[PDB]
Every structure is written in C-alpha cells, then in structure tokens.
Amino acid sequence: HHHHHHMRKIYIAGPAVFNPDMGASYYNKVRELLKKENVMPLIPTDNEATEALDIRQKNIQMIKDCDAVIADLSPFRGHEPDCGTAFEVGCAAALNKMVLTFTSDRRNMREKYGSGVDKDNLRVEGFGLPFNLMLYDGVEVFDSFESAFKYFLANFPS
Amino acid sequence: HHHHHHMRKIYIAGPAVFNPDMGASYYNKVRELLKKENVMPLIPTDNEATEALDIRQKNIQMIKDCDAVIADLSPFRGHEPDCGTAFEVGCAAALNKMVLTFTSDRRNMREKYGSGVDKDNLRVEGFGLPFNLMLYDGVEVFDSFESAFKYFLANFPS
Numbered sequence: 001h002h003h004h005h006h007m008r009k010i011y012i013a014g015p016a017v018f019n020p021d022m023g024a025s026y027y028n029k030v031r032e033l034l035k036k037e038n039v040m041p042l043i044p045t046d047n048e049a050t051e052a053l054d055i056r057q058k059n060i061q062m063i064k065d066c067d068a069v070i071a072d073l074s075p076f077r078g079h080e081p082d083c084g085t086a087f088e089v090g091c092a093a094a095l096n097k098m099v100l101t102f103t104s105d106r107r108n109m110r111e112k113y114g115s116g117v118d119k120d121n122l123r124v125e126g127f128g129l130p131f132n133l134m135l136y137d138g139v140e141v142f143d144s145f146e147s148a149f150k151y152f153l154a155n156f157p158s
Numbered sequence: 159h160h161h162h163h164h165m166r167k168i169y170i171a172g173p174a175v176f177n178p179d180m181g182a183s184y185y186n187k188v189r190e191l192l193k194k195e196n197v198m199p200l201i202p203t204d205n206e207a208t209e210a211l212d213i214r215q216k217n218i219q220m221i222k223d224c225d226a227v228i229a230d231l232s233p234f235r236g237h238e239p240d241c242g243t244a245f246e247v248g249c250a251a252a253l254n255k256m257v258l259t260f261t262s263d264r265r266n267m268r269e270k271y272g273s274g275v276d277k278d279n280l281r282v283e284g285f286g287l288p289f290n291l292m293l294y295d296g297v298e299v300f301d302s303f304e305s306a307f308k309y310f311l312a313n314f315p316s
C-alpha cells in the first residue's frame with residue numbers, strides 16, 4: 001500500500017507574466033487555489049532561464065508534462081488574446097491535452113470590434129466566438145481561472 | 159520503376175485570410191511560387207467548412223500532414239502577430255514539424271513599442287526578438303514568404 005501517486009499538474013498559460021510584477025499576484029492566487037486540491041501549478045516563470053530558447057523549451061516541456069492547460073485568453077493589447085498563450089494552446093491541442101480557456105470579455109469578435117471589419121477593413125470572424133476560432137475546441141469558454149479550474153476538478157479526478 | 163513519390167506540402171499560416179479578398183491575392187502568389195517547385199500549398203481556406211470546429215480540425219490536420227509550416231508573423235492589429243497563426247506555429251512545434259517564420263517588421267519588440275513597457279505599463283519582452291519568444295525556435299526570422307521558401311527548398315529536398 002505504497003503505490004505511486006500521480007499529482008495532477010496544470011500549465012498556467014496567459015499574459016499575466018507581462019504585468020509589472022511579472023505575474024506575481026496572479027500566480028500567487030493560482031498557487032493558493034490549486035494547493036487546496038493538491039494540484040501543482042506549472043508556471044511559465046518558474047526557475048526561469050536567461051536564454052529565450054531555454055525558456056521556450058522549458059515551457060513546451062511543462063505542456064508535455066501537464067494534465068491540462070488553463071489558458072487566459074483575455075484581451076491583450078487590444079481585443080486579441082496573447083500570441084504566446086495562443087502558441088501554448090496550439091502545443092497542448094497537438095499533444096491531445098485537456099485545454100481549458102477563459103477570458104474577461106466573452107462577447108463575439110464582431111461585438112468587440114463593433115463591425116464585421118476592423119479600422120483597417122480587415123475581416124473580423126463571424127462564428128459567434130470571442131476570439132480566433134483556432135482557440136476554441138468545443139469546451140465552454142469560462143469567465144475566470146476559478147471557473148475553468150472547477151471544470152478541471154470535475155473532469156480530471158485523482 | 160513507379161515507386162511512390164512524395165509531394166512536398168507546406169501549411170500556409172498567416173492572417174492573409176482576413177484581407178478583404180479573404181487572402182486571394184496572397185494565396186495566389188503562394189500557389190504560383192510553389193507550383194514551380196512541385197510543392198503543394200496547404201491553405202487554411204481550402205474546401206472551407208461552415209462550422210468553426212470543422213475548419214479548425216481541417217487546419218490541424220493540414221499541419222499534421224505538412225512537411226513544413228511557413229508562418230506569416232507580421233504585425234496584425236498592432237505590433238503583435240496573429241493569434242491564430244501563433245496557435246498553428248504551436249501545433250507544428252509540438253508535432254516536430256519544420257517551422258519557418260517571416261515578418262514585415264523585424265525590429266525587436268522594445269524597438270517597436272519604443273520602451274520596455276507598453277502604453278498600459280505592461281512589460282515588453284527584452285530578448286532581442288521581433289515577437290513573443292515562444293514563436294522563435296532558433297531558425298532565422300525571414301523578411302518574406304519567398305525567403306522562407308528558399309530555406310525550405312535548401313533544407314527539405316525531394
């Protein structure tokens with residue numbers, strides 16, 4: 001009765017890293033929430049290397065090692081989600097990982113831009129989705145990290 | 159004779175799809191360039207489905223089927239590349255595909271934003287790269303589709 005026990009792991013994707021505090025406040029909240037459920041956060045800035053390629057490789061490895069990704073696809077520098085987060089969602093999708101997404105703005109892209117085109121006459125997607133359709137996989141788009149985490153707990157038990 | 163011959167295939171990732179012509183002018187130029195070298199373009203809008211999930215699945219399948227991705231990481235709706243393209247680059251990276259990227263703007267992110275922070279005091283990466291570090295894998299960032307394609311021809315022969 002001392003079998004190996006898998007500790008669940010979630011990759012914490014999102015532009016919080018670009019906050020003035022490098023994501024400290026966001027990541028601390030994540031750490032506290034996950035601690036209660038014995039889930040390990042895999043955080044992009046953990047044991048951060050100095051070289052871009054090393055940072056990238058470590059983050060890809062975290063995605064490979066995770067049970068799920070919870071991705072913050074909130075508006076970043078406009079109505080579009082963060083590209084880095086989008087890359088990570090793509091990585092996870094290719095590796096058949098559970099991907100859970102949330103955003104602070106759930107309106108359709110055309111509601112966000114107020115038109116079928118942006119200010120430069122570039123087409124805004126019309127699929128009833130809050131962001132680029134590649135980022136949607138059929139799972140509900142959540143309103144917060146917490147709500148996404150509740151789905152994880154219900155659908156990925158120990 | 160009459161052994162099976164593999165036709166090389168390149169997934170054409172980029173926000174040209176959002177042009178007023180749905181990328182017609184871009185894709186036509188791509189088709190002509192690749193035709194000369196017996197390379198098949200895998201284009202996001204080819205045989206386009208109506209449902210978001212079907213379009214997504216077909217595009218993921220194209221990446222799975224490709225020999226390389228040439229991704230247009232040009233500024234889209236600001237200094238950041240397109241998120242959908244970023245997702246596709248992520249997918250390709252996880253699948254160990256050759257990923258080739260280009261941009262119309264090769265300046266470092268901090269040169270583009272003119273500061274180490276944006277207008278909202280959000281951190282701009284300082285790794286001497288033109289975009290989010292996740293999008294760089296050690297291969298040169300090219301100036302055009304054509305220059306990326308030249309690398310493909312030199313590094314993925316028939």
Ligand SMILES: Nc1cccc2cnccc12
Nearest residue numbers: 017044059084290291292
């Ligand atoms: N784009 C990025 C991905 C993963 C970690 C990072 C840490 N600092 C800046 C940018 C990052």
Ligand SMILES: Nc1cccc2cnccc12
Nearest residue numbers: 132133134175202217242
């Ligand atoms: N985001 C997208 C990915 C692949 C194909 C598309 C076609 N139209 C709009 C958006 C697309």
